[PDB]
Design a binder for these strands. Structure first.
Length: 48
DNA sequence: ATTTAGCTGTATAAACATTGTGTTATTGGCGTTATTAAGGTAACTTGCTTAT
């Protein structure tokens, strides 16, 4: 009904799924996704 | 015979024993705060890497 390309709607869902999969199976020991995101933000701040 | 020394008797005394009583303490319980997971989000990027 809205006039827009479907690629962006598909892209957001694909990106969310990939990030979630990486966090869930990223390490042999399961680590919380919220804990992982804060660690990623801290690492980016340290790099800057 | 007499008593004397011997013997510890059992009450008593003392110690224990038993009873009772207090105390406390911990389980349970409840709720509680730390934690946490998932859902959802939509300009666009629509056959890869990855390698002696």
């Amino acid at each position: 009904r809205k006039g827009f390309k479907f690629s962006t709607y598909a892209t957001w869902w694909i990106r969310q799924a990939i990030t979630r999969s990486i966090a869930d199976q990223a390490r042999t020991i399961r680590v919380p996704v919220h804990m992982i995101e804060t660690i990623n933000k801290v690492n980016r701040i340290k790099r800057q």
